[PDB]
Design a protein around this ligand. Structure first.
Ligand code: TA1
Ligand code: GTP
Ligand code: GDP
Ligand code: MG
Ligand code: MG
Lengths: 175, 432, 440
């Protein structure tokens, strides 16, 4: 988890809408050849939700606590078509590094769960490189273990982006 | 033209740095006062790597000295090579950590870190093109571990692109000198695994074994151990300073050695180490150096390479020699010891050759291995760590300075994950 | 006029250039300081030929060379050596660290900046040039600079000049020995460059030349100097036709015409026949037939590739010295008689012959013996496909687990480029497999 994260409380929809607008304004955004408003950073929106019941005879207080995590990832880039220079190139390199780590952990998880499920049931040992990047570190419980998780892949229709679209489809199949 | 900024922390780091600066000043013909009295023109060609130039045609090492005990600084100044250093780089305070990692990292070092970083910035801004840093310190102690980790973190925050080396003296298996070595070692390794590019593991017991069995010294002192570590340190960065048939920058070693980011713990070695008594018997050839480098007795980390496999190795030779013989010997070492090298990194032996050998030796070589056997070291520390953390053996000293059990637990978890990552390549037969 | 520009990239390129320019200066009688005593001695003739050297007003001859490297060490060795006054001071050194065996560093983040200066120098050399023949690019796979910067420079040259020939002399990784862990990644990423933009690439292997030195030359502990001298002899034999008179002269264009049946199979093998020590120079005739037969010996190939596993697509012979076409015709006839050498059924012509009168020279301090006759062979054959296959397997063994990948990704490269390059290389391999099938 993250220390000293400014977790605030909202009571009506107007407050959370204001928070949403402020957060979107605060996000780092830069223009590039592939997108006029490309994203330069991964983003996580977290809702901590608590249900309490009040009755001295039957009910339990603080009976339920749950987390909604909504993750917007920055996509892969190619310097030839991207046209980045200087800081943009460094941001693209870091994004690609984090996404490579995410792909590796996805593939390793897939193989690990499939094998012990199908092969026999050995469960000998299978290291998973969660720690190689901060993105996969923060999302450890969502990519596996204690969470119910959904992956929404976006795909470009054009023929020129075929090699990237096929990779996205392959990783969706692995996920 | 490349520079290296040098940082020294703690007693062990200070002494190793002093011996290192004496070995380097010899190689370059700098006199204990800063004046050049060499003979070969190649000595001054690349002297900018370590030494700044002064107005009086003198040379001043680009070194930074850090501690919280003035005694070490006083010992360094009152020495054969004390006046060579500039006095402004002597940064220190009082009331040392006393083998308390928390004091070094959180309480006391937090005040001196600003001054150390100011001197680091002043030295770094004057370089034409800075390459990286290197730090000498001891993990099992106080100010060494804490201030070294804090400085590493701050510099990586400020200089993300540059290289960060580290020559760390880790706790020994059975030899011990402080009661609380596992706590400091575990926390320091937790800090190092995130914020470094290379880390050369050094063990006191391995150096004692080298002194006793190989060099046949009867009464070895710390000077000898510093000598060895200093010969290793020079041997690492030889190609930045002298020409060679096939150079090898620091980045070349970093790229060719580590396969994955979290595995950058290297076992070093040096050859030829004889006995002052059998120098007249052993002929000096490339096969002899290759035989001595890969010998398990010659490692400085006190971890047997035969209990694991070499992910990568790097051999840096210095002296006139033939590339055919070197390549043939590396291939031979791979082929005969086929069981000690991973099967999914074909031809995992980096080679470098430098033309200029050390002062009075015809040939020399240094070895940098990256083997899974290093896991044993961590396991030992982890074992001892549990043996004290379960009962909270000495925990009040650490929690009194502003820490909690969560830091210890997460450091132990990081250590165990590192050990598992090394283990998962250790076995042969990747299928089932 | 007939001349070509030599470009050298990386440590291997610079050292091969040292050997090559030593040989050229010895051939043309130019002293290390650039002066030619024959000009003042004779007062006429043509000795400092325009093919490599340019004559200024004061009689000094300056080479048409362009040295490039990211390190300062290797070229600073040249700038304070025996040939310090020969070269123009423009040596194009990047005052930083090196590509670190990273294609991304040599192609994306650091390979730029100095690329513009390099192209400016090449343009300045070309503007002084009349009737430029082409470029001779020296580099090496397995190095970050020699791969990435070669890619950048070849791309820019193809964009700018285009129709000019661009030959390549590169050192392929050896099957067994190497000096880098990440060599296959660089060698597999350089294939798009070596395929699309180059016109004809000559590949050599360190292991083969080591075996040649051990067997033929009786050198027990050879170093890179001997290898560079051999490669210099090969390049000199290739380019001699532009300089000296001869009965059957072959320039670069007509040389290319008879060695590239199709655009995508321009990967010949190179050999040099009379590699022999001074002691063994006696006891042997070294006639035309002997050297022509020795060119075909599988042990004498300079790449670890057995010709008997494939078919010969084309062959070009370049003879030097006291050679007469009658003996060459006899050698060609008796070779065509032999059944061990297999030629594709769609190339009945087979051989191209070129003859030059100037015999090879002897470098002082060298190892090759002075001989009256010599021959350099270039041969387009399918067996080179095998030499690629052994590499590709290694790449797979490193790419399955994504080892060392993060170093490449952290400098601009994308993960998919590896797979793209691998697919391109597989396409090339299957093309070579297809071209050799017998017609029906
Ligand atoms: C016969 C002869 O010439 O004497 C040798 C000698 O006998 C041996 C034993 C030397 C000797 O070293 C030791 O005895 C020793 C003892 C404890 C710890 C370290 C060394 C020597 O002291 C060490 C010394 O080495 C050097 O001078 C190197 O340049 C070395 N630098 C220093 O030792 C040095 C120390 C203080 C101040 C200035 C220089 C070096 C090596 C690698 C990289 C940089 C520098 C040499 C040749 C010798 C003696 C004098 C006996 C050896 O050391 C080295 C690294 O050369 C030990 O194994 C080698 C092999 C040598 O044959
Ligand atoms: N035959 C021959 N091979 C060489 C020579 N020099 C280097 N090599 C080979 O080239 C390979 C890679 O070296 P280089 O391509 O020169 O590396 P580089 O050009 O300096 O580029 P960087 O890695 O960025 O420094 C090595 O593995 C050597 O085997 C040489 O002089 N002759
Ligand atoms: N190799 C080596 N180790 C040393 C030397 N001096 C002390 N040590 C080691 O350092 C440990 C004690 O740590 P210490 O140096 O006091 O840490 P500090 O107080 O922070 O400087 C012991 O385990 C010793 O083995 C030396 O000169 N050389
Ligand atoms: Mg977006
Ligand atoms: Mg190099």
């Amino acid at each position: 988890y993250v220390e000293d994260l400014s977790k605030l409380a909202v009571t009506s929809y107007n407050d959370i809408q204001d928070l949403m607008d402020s957060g979107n304004k605060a996000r780092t955004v830069a223009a590039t050849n592939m997108n006029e408003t490309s994203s330069r950073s991964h983003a996580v929106f977290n809702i901590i939700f608590t249900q309490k019941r009040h009755d001295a005879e039957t009910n339990i207080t603080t009976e339920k606590v749950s987390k909604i995590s909504l993750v917007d990832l920055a996509g892969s880039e190619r310097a030839d078509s991207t046209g980045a220079k200087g800081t943009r190139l460094k941001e693209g390199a870091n994004i690609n590094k984090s996404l490579t780590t995410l792909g590796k952990v996805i593939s390793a998880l897939a193989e690990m769960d499939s094998g012990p499920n199908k092969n026999k049931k050995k469960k000998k040992t299978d290291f998973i490189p969660y720690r190689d990047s901060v993105l996969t570190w923060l999302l450890r419980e969502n990519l596996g273990g204690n969470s119910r998780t959904a992956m929404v892949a976006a795909l470009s229709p054009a023929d020129i982006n075929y090699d990237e679209t096929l990779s996205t489809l392959r990783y969706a199949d692995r996920a | 033209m490349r520079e290296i900024v040098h940082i020294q922390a703690g007693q062990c780091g200070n002494q190793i740095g002093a011996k290192f600066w004496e070995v380097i000043s010899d190689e370059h013909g700098i006199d204990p006062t800063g004046s050049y009295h060499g003979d070969s023109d190649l000595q001054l060609e690349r002297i900018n790597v370590y030494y700044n130039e002064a107005t009086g045609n003198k040379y001043v090492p680009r070194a930074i000295l850090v501690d919280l005990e003035p005694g070490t600084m006083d010992s360094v100044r009152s020495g054969p090579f004390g006046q060579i250093f500039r006095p402004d780089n002597f940064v220190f305070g009082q009331s040392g950590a006393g083998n308390n990692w928390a004091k070094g990292h959180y309480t006391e070092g937090a005040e001196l870190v600003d001054s150390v970083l100011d001197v680091v910035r002043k030295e770094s801004e004057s370089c034409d093109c800075l390459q990286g840093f290197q730090l000498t310190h001891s993990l099992g102690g106080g100010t060494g571990s804490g201030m070294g980790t804090l400085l590493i973190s701050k510099i990586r925050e400020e200089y993300p692109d540059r290289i960060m080396n580290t020559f760390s003296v880790m706790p020994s298996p059975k030899v011990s000198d402080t009661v609380v070595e596992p706590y400091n070692a575990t926390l320091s390794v937790h800090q190092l695994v995130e914020n470094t590019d290379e880390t050369y593991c050094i063990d006191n017991e391995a150096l004692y074994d080298i002194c006793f069995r190989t060099l046949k010294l009867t009464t070895p002192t710390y000077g000898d151990l510093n000598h060895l570590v200093s010969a290793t340190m020079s041997g690492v960065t030889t190609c930045l300073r002298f020409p060679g048939q096939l150079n090898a920058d620091l980045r070349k070693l970093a790229v060719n050695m580590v396969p994955f980011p979290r595995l950058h713990f290297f076992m070093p070695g040096f050859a030829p180490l004889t006995s002052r008594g059998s120098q007249q018997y052993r002929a000096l050839t490339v096969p002899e150096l290759t035989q001595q480098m890969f010998d398990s007795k010659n490692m400085m980390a006190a971890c047997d390479p035969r209990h694991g496999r070499y992910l990568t190795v790097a051999a840096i030779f210095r002296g006139r020699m033939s590339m055919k013989e070197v390549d043939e010997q590396m291939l031979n070492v791979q082929n005969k010891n086929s069981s000690y090298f991973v099967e999914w990194i074909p031809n995992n032996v980096k080679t470098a050759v430098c033309d200029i050998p050390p002062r009075g030796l015809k040939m020399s070589a240094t070895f940098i291995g990256n083997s899974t056997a290093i896991q044993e070291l961590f396991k030992r520390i982890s074992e001892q760590f549990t043996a004290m953390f379960r009962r909270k053996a000495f925990l009040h000293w650490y929690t009194g300075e502003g820490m909690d059990e969560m830091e210890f637990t997460e450091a132990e978890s990081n250590m165990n994950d590192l050990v598992s990552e090394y283990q998962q390549y250790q076995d042969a037969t990747a299928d089932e | 006029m007939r001349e070509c520009i030599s470009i050298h990239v990386g440590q291997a390129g610079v050292q091969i250039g040292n050997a090559c320019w030593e040989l050229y200066c010895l051939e043309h009688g130019i002293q290390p300081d650039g002066q030619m005593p024959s000009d003042k001695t004779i007062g006429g003739g043509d000795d400092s030929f325009n093919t490599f050297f340019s004559e200024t007003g004061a009689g000094k001859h300056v080479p048409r060379a362009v040295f490039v490297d990211l390190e300062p060490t290797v070229i600073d060795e040249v700038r304070t050596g025996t040939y310090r006054q020969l070269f123009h001071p423009e040596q194009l050194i990047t005052g930083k660290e090196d590509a670190a065996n990273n294609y991304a560093r040599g192609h994306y983040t650091i390979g730029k900046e100095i690329i513009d200066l390099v192209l400016d120098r090449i343009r300045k050399l070309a503007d002084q040039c009349t009737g430029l023949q082409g470029f001779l690019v020296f580099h090496s796979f397995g190095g970050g600079t020699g791969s990435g910067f070669t890619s950048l420079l070849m791309e820019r040259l193809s964009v700018d000049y285009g129709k000019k020939s661009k030959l390549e002399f590169s050192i392929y990784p050896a099957p067994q020995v190497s000096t880098a862990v990440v060599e296959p990644y660089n060698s597999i990423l350089t294939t798009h460059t070596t395929l699309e933009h180059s016109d004809c690439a000559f590949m050599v292997d360190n292991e083969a030349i080591y075996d040649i030195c051990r067997r033929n030359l009786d050198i027990e502990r050879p170093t890179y100097t001997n290898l560079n001298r051999l490669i210099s002899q090969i390049v000199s034999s290739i380019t001699a036709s532009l300089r000296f008179d001869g009965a059957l002269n072959v320039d670069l264009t007509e040389f290319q015409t008879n060695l590239v049946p199709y655009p995508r199979i321009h990967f010949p093998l190179a050999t040099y026949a009379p590699v022999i020590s001074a002691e063994k120079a006696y006891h042997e005739q070294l006639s035309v037939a002997e050297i022509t037969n020795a060119c075909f010996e599988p042990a004498n190939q300079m790449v670890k590739c057995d010709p008997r596993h494939g078919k010969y697509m084309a062959c070009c012979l370049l003879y030097r010295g006291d050679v007469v076409p009658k003996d060459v015709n006899a050698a060609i006839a008796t070779i065509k008689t032999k059944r061990s050498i297999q030629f594709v059924d769609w190339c009945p012509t087979g051989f191209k012959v070129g003859i030059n009168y100037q015999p090879p020279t002897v470098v002082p301090g060298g190892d090759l013996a002075k001989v009256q006759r010599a021959v350099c062979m270039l041969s387009n054959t399918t067996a080179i496909a095998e030499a690629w296959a052994r590499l590709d397997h290694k790449f797979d063994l490193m790419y399955a687990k994504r080892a060392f990948v993060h170093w490449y990704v952290g400098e601009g490269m994308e993960e998919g480029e590896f797979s793209e390059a691998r697919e391109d290389m597989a396409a090339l391999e299957k093309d070579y497999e297809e071209v050799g099938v017998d017609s029906v």
